[PDB]
Symmetry: C3
């Protein structure tokens, strides 16, 4: 009887940050209420000024990370304002039935809908738009995110002991397919609908023009680099709704990794690089041991350094010479 | 002494169906006899009427699923009728030695051969044609299938308890590389041999023109959708002999998954999407909990919805509102 | 106090061979000293005579395999002779901090440097050059290798029992992106620097022109085929610093496989094919049971047989008819 359960309303935050939550559940099962507003918007995705018409949940690419516990109910109010132009919906990979909710959430501009599902399987999971006949166009225009369903007793290592993170970040990785003219220059369009047949052609090459974290080349750098301190335990949730990726922390490891993101399985230990298949979210746990700049990349290094799939961590603290040291500095 | 073992002759069935077998072995080890006839045939692979010269085992793409138990012997009579034009052979990934049988089964048109091997490792495994110097051309023209070697005591979950399936389907996923003219139109040829150098060029792009289940765009839809009922336990065996895929059941999960297909390993639990590497067969177990239409896709959604790698399940039974419900239907 | 530890100097060998080492550590922790000299050189990579300017560690592609034990210290003297033209460095995925050593090892032509790091995690790991702003160009010109950090008590199976190998080989798999003219012919350049902007363009296609083992099409064939005898236990270490691969031993299996290369995890058993993600090293253990020629391939068979990712094993010993036999040889 869902009417007797507590309701809690969560206000979402912009990636790569994640809304406040408890790791170990401090209440019984709840109905967790979220609201998302769909926003079609122009986005500049690279240093050259290339512009696309992005399709977003809550204004960002990726959409925000939702966090619940196993056997909570997720109730999402999804709003498609009349300032948009397309029909949208939502498919949660966490959910069971009706194409993950997709069959029940088709909203034209000026409509809203409220969906409820029970979060029966713990893990991180992708969610994405999936309108009949235009599924890859919406997804590859940015209309995807993830949801984390924590076990009620939090995360566990390969021996069943508790793993507690101090910080959590969400990296959404996006493959874009910007149409090109004859000579290879990117095309601009005034409306999303203009791009349609050119988008289909660009997608069928299976070759992205850009692969980015958090919606743009260089988004997780400079003032927007991820931060941590030596000794901190960090969980990085990484999703890719359409195409395989292989995350790597340059200068670190994945101490505990759930590459396909499902927490009833034991983690893989000591990973250098891990494969997250397209249509999946994964999670990696690392304890920082050295200060400085780290790069977090898709380790197809062309995809990283030429197409955009690279961000930075900036880590403060004390250097440990026992782990690494320069014995003789570069000299002639 | 193989002469004292029982022989049993199995008549194969067309994918996605699978020949009758017992999960738990009801006899001791047997010599299991199969016959396959090679058929080169014209195939229409898409809605536009694109035609290729396919190279098939037993008339289908994929070839049929063979099912034995661990430590049975597989005896295959392979027939290459004189109405074909090419030399063919067979390589079983399940077998040990002689290039998986490939070195011993080279049959010109008008020849046959009988191979026997011991099925020493349990799992699902790819088989494919692999003639010296033309291996990828045969495989990517459809000349591949799979064999399942069950443990004698059937399948087990991660705790070693029995898993029994009620139904089993075989999805063979095929990457095709149809040659194109200058403008991008598909070429037609009168014989398989005509296509050869154009096929090599198309393959070297590493970009398929079509990726299909069961030999054509839309093959596992409509009247040919897969079926199940709420409460049924379904095993889906999925192979890809040449290129990685990432299956996903839209609206469901892989409750127990052997992504690389080998049953002495514990399954991965609660998977949203899993990676089957090219040259591998995998298997996923799911118990249906909700009725309706499900889509089973490669979750590179371009490969699914633009290139053809999507099929449907149609599931009958009772809707469970506790798992999912529309609280407020789309409305303005 | 590192000054009181034993030092040992290791002389490296050319892949696919591996320098002598003990599986089970016969000493306490040591400082293990290696020297590598960077060599930019012209390399012929295919039968047609296509030439590239390769960037190598110690003259080979891949660079040599280094072998230490967990909690040894690795001290590498890296030398960039003044006959080279570019700045280079080294990033070890095995190491913790400073971009895996990359930030501390930038050597112009005519410089050297000595780096020390503690090998705290057991596994096989990639190392590669990674100079600021030109990372994929160096890596995809051949400037990568691997390091194996053995547990002090050697390798273990899924039940924690010892696994001892009789022979070990190192297969480095390399994706090359040779620039092409308008018609599709490969370009030649006099110096590495000439190629730069053409290399970036070729890389951005994400489509390699060649994928090779040990630096050339056919390198591990003929007189240079890998060898073993029936009954021998062979460990094959395989790396790919930039792009996913899916190794398969044609006619065999991976009896015990660490696909992502980290030995605190239990191995996967009975693998037909396994995925090594780009930026990773993996390891497979197999006991040969049948004599003859085996092919070891990336099982995207186009990448194998058209682009070059195939080698051979030649195995001596006795044929076992119980495992496989021709019952009726090909006949009309
Ligand atoms: O405002 N662009 O959808
Ligand atoms: O856009 N309707 O709430
Ligand atoms: O599905 N693309 O890796
Ligand atoms: O192929 N996915 O990077
Ligand atoms: O070691 N990072 O490419
Ligand atoms: O899917 N579990 O890593
Ligand atoms: O009949 N075509 O091979
Ligand atoms: O085609 N010979 O049986
Ligand atoms: O091997 N192709 O994913
Ligand atoms: O790259 N395989 O879809
Ligand atoms: O959730 N299916 O793409
Ligand atoms: O290969 N076993 O999933
Ligand atoms: O000698 N070529 O770098
Ligand atoms: O090249 N300096 O040792
Ligand atoms: O990262 N390329 O498979
Ligand atoms: O996509 N890697 O073969
Ligand atoms: O079975 N080798 O492709
Ligand atoms: O990463 N261990 O296979
Ligand atoms: Cu949408
Ligand atoms: Cu999906
Ligand atoms: Cu054939
Ligand atoms: Cu094969
Ligand atoms: Cu370099
Ligand atoms: Cu790296």
């Amino acid at each position: 009887d869902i009417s007797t359960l507590p309701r809690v309303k969560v206000d979402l935050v912009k990636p790569p940050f994640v809304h406040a939550h408890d790791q170990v559940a401090k209440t019984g099962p709840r109905v967790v209420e979220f609201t998302m507003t769909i926003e079609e918007k122009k986005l500049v995705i690279d240093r050259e000024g290339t512009e696309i018409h992005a399709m977003t949940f809550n204004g960002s690419v990726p959409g925000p990370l939702m966090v619940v516990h196993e056997n909570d109910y997720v109730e999402l109010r999804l709003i498609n304002p009349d300032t948009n132009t397309l029909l949208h919906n939502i498919d949660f990979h966490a959910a069971t039935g009706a194409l993950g909710g997709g069959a029940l959430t088709q909203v034209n501009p000026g409509e809203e809908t409220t969906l409820r599902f029970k979060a029966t399987k713990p893990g991180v999971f992708v969610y994405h738009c999936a309108p009949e006949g235009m599924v890859p166009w919406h997804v590859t225009s940015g209309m995807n995110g993830a949801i984390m369903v924590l076990p009620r007793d939090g995360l566990k290592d390969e021996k069943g002991q508790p793993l507690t993170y101090d910080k959590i970040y969400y990296v959404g990785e996006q493959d874009f397919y910007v149409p090109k003219d004859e000579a290879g220059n990117y095309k601009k369009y005034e409306t999303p609908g203009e791009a349609y047949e050119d988008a289909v052609k660009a997608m069928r090459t299976l070759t992205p023009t850009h692969i980015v974290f958090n919606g743009a080349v260089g988004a997780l750098t400079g003032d927007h680099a991820l931060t941590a301190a030596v000794g901190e335990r960090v969980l990085v949730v990484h999703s890719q709704a359409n195409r395989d990726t292989r995350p790597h922390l340059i200068g670190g490891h994945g101490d505990y990794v759930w590459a396909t993101g499902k927490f009833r399985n034991p983690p893989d230990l000591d990973q250098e690089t891990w494969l997250i298949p397209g249509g999946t979210a994964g999670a990696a746990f690392y304890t920082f041991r050295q200060p400085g700049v780290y790069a977090y990349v898709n380790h197809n290094l062309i995809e990283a350094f030429e197409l955009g799939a690279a961000g930075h961590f900036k880590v403060t603290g004390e250097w440990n010479d026992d782990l690494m040291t320069s014995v003789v500095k570069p000299a002639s």
